[PDB]
Amino acid sequence: AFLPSAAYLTHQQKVLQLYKRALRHLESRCVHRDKYRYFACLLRARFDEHKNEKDMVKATQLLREAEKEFWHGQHPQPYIFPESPGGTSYERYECYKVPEWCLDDWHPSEKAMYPDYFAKREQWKKLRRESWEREVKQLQEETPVGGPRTEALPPARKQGDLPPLWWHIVTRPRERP
Amino acid sequence: GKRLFIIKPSGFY
Amino acid sequence: GAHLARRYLGDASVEPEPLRMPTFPPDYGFPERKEREMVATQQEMNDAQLVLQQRDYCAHYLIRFLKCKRDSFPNFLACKHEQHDWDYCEHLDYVKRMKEFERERRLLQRKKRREQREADMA
Amino acid sequence: SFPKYEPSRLASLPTTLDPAEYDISSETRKAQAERLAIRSRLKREYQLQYNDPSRRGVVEDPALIRWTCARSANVYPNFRPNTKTSLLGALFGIGPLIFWYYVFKTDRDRKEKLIQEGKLDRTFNISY
Amino acid sequence: MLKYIIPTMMLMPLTWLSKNSMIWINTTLHSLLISLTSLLLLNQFGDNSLNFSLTFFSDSLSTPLLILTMWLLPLMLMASQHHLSKENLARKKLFISMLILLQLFLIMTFTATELIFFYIMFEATLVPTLIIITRWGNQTERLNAGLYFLFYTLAGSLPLLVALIYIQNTMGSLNFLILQYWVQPMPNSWSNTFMWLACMMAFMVKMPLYGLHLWLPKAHVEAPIAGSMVLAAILLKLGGYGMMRITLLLNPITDFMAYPFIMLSLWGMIMTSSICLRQTDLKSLIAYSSVSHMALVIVAILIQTPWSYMGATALMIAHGLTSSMLFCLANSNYERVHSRTMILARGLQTLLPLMAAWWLLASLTNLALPPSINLIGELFVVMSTFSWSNITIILMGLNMVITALYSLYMLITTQRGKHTHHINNILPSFTRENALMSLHMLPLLLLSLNPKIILGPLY
Amino acid sequence: AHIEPRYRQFPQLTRSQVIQAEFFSATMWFWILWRFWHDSDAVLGHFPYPDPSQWTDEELGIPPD
Amino acid sequence: SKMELPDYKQWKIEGTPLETVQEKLAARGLRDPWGRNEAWRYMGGFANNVSFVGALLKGFKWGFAAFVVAVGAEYYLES
Amino acid sequence: DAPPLTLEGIKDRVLYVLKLYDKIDPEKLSVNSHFMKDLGLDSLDQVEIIMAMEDEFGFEIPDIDAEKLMCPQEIVDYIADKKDVYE
Amino acid sequence: ITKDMLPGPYPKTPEERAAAAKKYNMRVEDYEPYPDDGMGYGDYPKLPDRSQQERDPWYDWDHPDLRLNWGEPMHWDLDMYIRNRVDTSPTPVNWNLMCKHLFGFVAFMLFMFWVGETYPTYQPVGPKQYPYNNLYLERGGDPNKEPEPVVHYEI
Amino acid sequence: SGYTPDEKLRLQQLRELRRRWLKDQELSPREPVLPPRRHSIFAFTHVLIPVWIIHYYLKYHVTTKPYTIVEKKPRIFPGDTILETGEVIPPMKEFPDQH
Ligand SMILES: CCCCCCCCCCCCCCCCCC(=O)OC[C@H](COP(=O)([O-])OC[C@H](O)COP(=O)([O-])OC[C@H](COC(=O)CCCCCCCCCCCCCCCCC)OC(=O)CCCCCCCCCCCCCCCCC)OC(=O)CCCCCCCCCCCCCCCCC
Ligand SMILES: CCCCCCCCCCCCCCCCCC(=O)OC[C@H](COP(=O)([O-])OCC[N+](C)(C)C)OC(=O)CCCCCCCCCCCCCCCCC
Ligand SMILES: CCCCCCCCCCCCCCCCCC(=O)OC[C@H](COP(=O)(O)OCCN)OC(=O)CCCCCCCCCCCCCCCCC
Ligand SMILES: *C(=O)CCCCCCCCCCCCC
Known about the structure:
10 chains, B: little secondary structure, F: 0% strand, binds 1,2-Distearoyl-sn-glycerophosphoethanolamine, transport (chain E)
């Protein structure tokens, strides 16, 4: 439906995502660990019954009525992990995730308070600006004509090169800044 | 031990 | 709360309406009925700054309790007896209100039996 | 069996209950792959500018500029006065004006009549 | 008044004889000295106005508008010196000359004893404003903006001219002091109906009236920052000042001529405030909020009670300071991201916290947080309109809901949430920028300590 | 010494938090029992509620006719 | 620094309600593979927690003892 | 509060949860044991392993990431990347 | 930015529809403009009218708080469908059934408050008795006038 | 099936660079290099000087004006003695005792 690498979900991926959603909603309905553990084994037994189904039309039909089964039997307030989307602590620390480029705008009196940090920051900046042209020419010699098909990026292929488009993955803020 | 640098904008100005 | 069921589910002609009662004269059934005696002077409970809800026929025990409560500070547990005297006289006032309600209910029963006897006789 | 989900304007149909989610036909695979190709091209075009060390500024999005231009400046060149726009422009443009005119006029005529007949209690009203 | 007119004119040789590096410093310094001097106009009396000469007077209506006008010029110079840094030196001096000339026309617009001299200064303000918008505005649309601003005004104001000259032929004078004692009642007729429209529609355009407001979200948006500051803070208030002077002559016909316009204002502040909920351009949102705030001043002047005039002049001063500060805040983000799209640069409190505090205070004054003079003017107008008709509280109170909703949405979109990743040119706030915000916000908050000087002639 | 975290087992308890928790639980039950011993009428009733059917017609003034 | 985890072999589901769960699953031909992962919740210091009336009556014993001591104290102090 | 995670601690806890799983014998398990090719597990078993990892460390692994964690070392590297360990 | 990347008039010929689909960075088979009824939309695409809350939150969005990529055509009401605002997400209970249950609960409670107002509870007591002509001077009665005597008796 | 070998290699290289970046966020033992820089003073500065200022303001500026501090008149009971007059308030009438 919407994925960065794949254009779709396969049938096997849909079955596994239904199985995980159904177990999480069953754990929300079935709060206690032994009671959840019993009904989770029963749900695994319901998933193992039609596991060796070769007819893909029959399997798609079973998946579709199993989604109707889930939509009838879901919890109205399922458990959400706190940093997970919809959680009570989700995107809580984004106000503290200052991007690294703001350190370029510091005054020299407050850069002098951290001499070794900024001396070590400048060699990261030097590494990034000497890696940039090599990784651009890596991307354009490896992307096919008409543009990239998927959003997957290649690794570094030579000894000495960095992976293309690495800086905002590496220098991203911490989850607890 | 293991004090971490806190990235913050410039508070000088 | 049986009177609610007797007024709402039964007949309302024999049950006293609370918003307009007594509907009978106070001397109707009483030879030489005496008035309620007010102990606290109107100026006394004016100077004691009582709430107008509290200036009823038993405000004198309230004035005694408030004078105790002022004079026994900081011992705020030291006027249980004056408070109980005021609470007991309020209890007696509420019992008098219950007696007025039961009096009006029995007189409406008397009027019901009177009109039924008049209908059956003549 | 189970109560069928009835989608509304403000409560859409789930992805897992949509019948077109289970289309395995080759034309839907081509459409999904072509959408992935457009999104990957826009993604690469964005993050080649986003990861540039020499760049210091705003990576301009022509989609955002295009949206803000459509919301403001393209509206009157694409307006045609017809039955729909005239009947909506007069219902929502002068309709409430007539409504609040008659409400406030009726209220002030009634209040002025009560004051000149000595009926409106205006006893301590000296601030106005 | 000539102790203010002559230093304002002496700012012209001061800007044209200054050294090239000194033209902002010198004009800022001496315009601040003129603004300090402007407090001598607070010699106001409980009965008489301060009547200087045959040509000039100043009561408690014109005095806060004069102090705000003379205060806004140094703040406009501070706001404009950064984006005109690369400008040619003579064009920079011509820009400062247009601001000085606009101050000169405004200070004798508000003090003009006679109404046709009020008309000439009132219309003379158009020419520097038109030049500032069309010459130093940033975009193409400034040219079209300069046409709308020019031609909604004159089409309203040329019937005023005729009307004023008619009063000159009927009363024998257009001295406002003479017209205070020689005013005759204006009865119900068609001649007096179009007399009323000719006296009122130029100021209805200047306020702006809803439905006549369309020049403003082009003129205030396409202007440079000093243009937007003087347009929102001062030039809208020429309409309110002119109404408060001209409705002396329009009684008792106003008591039913006001009914359509009041409707246009009472529903119009519901409309334009709602428009602010869906504005994508931040500067357009601030402009539509100005239309919504001036709708209350229109209602308050048309119902013509003491409480409504006091609320309307307090709301005019308060809106001047608040809207000028909001345009300066939006400009401080525009001078970093070079786009007025409000959804573009987000999460700015993580990057610019003190400027986010200025955004917070300007939003709180925009939504009329008590005890700000914004709330004093707002509340007094609401009291008087409730006395006018008790149902108006609905359209009043609902407005105060929506006014809160667009004020904080503006604050939530630009300051809160996650910062935009690809925007990396968010410089720390300059001392000039925080200074500009404080010179708006600190006098605005200090006026809550003593609001009687901004309550007008019938305090 | 501060509390060291544990894995899959019951945490370390300080003696002080246990004696404070037991002291305030005991203080709650002491206060409930003490006030119930001394007041006993804020819960159970202060004054006897009279029965209106037991009232004679002589004290209510009901002439039998 | 280094945290020493307890031994994994001690987490056995015998004596826990996971044993009852495994019995009721084996009655219908099933088996629970994640029981020993959940077994720590029902063992050790987390086994045998109080009931709800045992939770409300926390401190009732010492509170009643102090009550009896204070009632005897005032009963001797009045005389 | 909130004790910091180490790579050795994450590895110990991942292997601990996998040793408490009855479909994996704890003597054949290593950090590089592929769940399907070495341990002979199902994809449903892999979903349950990732759910036990989520319950262990208290955060959610999304399904686009969970389907690719096919050995304990990939799980340890994922938890290391999402919690920024060895700062 | 330039003129042929700005929005324009409604596309009529299929090659105009194709080039405006190319302009908004989307497929021709997915590009549907708003219907040409003169409301002022032009060639701007009618996107499926979903909130940004319905977007996949685990995807690497270019704008993660907005759940929106760079160059993706924004919905006409994107400022309306932000996550601070109107949510269109699927609900566990159907919309019409939610409206029926909420309206039925509120209407039943208002009806029963009206019923209990018509049939109130009270206690079997008479009215509260106050001395001094029902506290005539205390309630603000003027002392130059004299009320009727309100006399209460023992019972 | 898990990762492709390109995904494994890219995640390994990004992992190494990310852990180098996170290691480079630790401070030196000299950092932050800072520039070179009465027991009951709270009850004196926050209590007693404000009580002095506020008592001066209330005594000589607020209560010198009419109706600025208006106090409810004190509650008078039967049996009280007035300080300003000496007039003893007479007690209440004897109670018709109830219990
Ligand atoms: C004539 C003499 C007068 C003397 C007294 C002064 C009277 C008021 C004048 C104006 C004062 C405003 C100055 C501060 C705010 C602006 C700057 C700022 O944000 O600085 C932060 C900074 C400290 O913060 P930081 O940690 O360094 O960095 C900030 C962070 O980035 C992040 O910042 P942040 O968000 O964490 O913190 C901002 C915070 C944010 O907090 C809020 O926004 C919440 C405020 C609203 C709710 C609470 C208040 C509700 C109303 C009650 C108060 C009024 C009535 C009280 C009376 C009793 C009831 C009637 O604001 C405050 O804490 C400011 C406190 C005062 C707020 C006033 C009301 C503003 C609300 C909007 C209008 C409301 C109506 C108008 C009220 C006018 C009253 C006079 O402050 C300063 O450095 C202050 C500098 C010096 C200020 C001088 C003030 C006077 C200037 C006048 C000069 C001429 C006369 C000489 C007098 C001089 C006296 C010393
Ligand atoms: C911004 C856009 C809208 C602007 C609106 C501006 C005001 C609208 C009304 C203007 C009317 C014309 C000027 C009236 C001056 C009144 C002076 C006076 O003494 O009047 C009484 C006089 C009365 O004549 P008299 O005073 O000589 O007579 C002696 C007195 N009696 C009557 C007793 C014998 O009125 C007139 O002579 C005519 C008044 C109406 C004029 C109609 C023609 C103009 C129509 C409106 C045009 C408005 C602008 C159009 C352009 C729009 C934009 C492109
Ligand atoms: C004594 C009498 C008692 C009477 C009681 C009954 C009267 C009132 C009846 C109900 C009216 C108010 C309720 C409706 C508006 C509520 C708006 C609101 O809270 O929206 C919240 C919404 C998102 O919130 P949510 O989805 O819960 O968040 C989860 C995390 N995403 O957030 C958004 O969508 C943001 C939207 C911002 C813009 C909102 C526009 C609507 C404004 C409505 C104003 C109504 C004014 C009424 C005036 C009445 C005058 C008397
Ligand atoms: C007659 O019934 C008088 C009592 C007040 C009206 C009925 C109140 C019913 C609810 C209170 C009693 C609940 C007992 C569990």
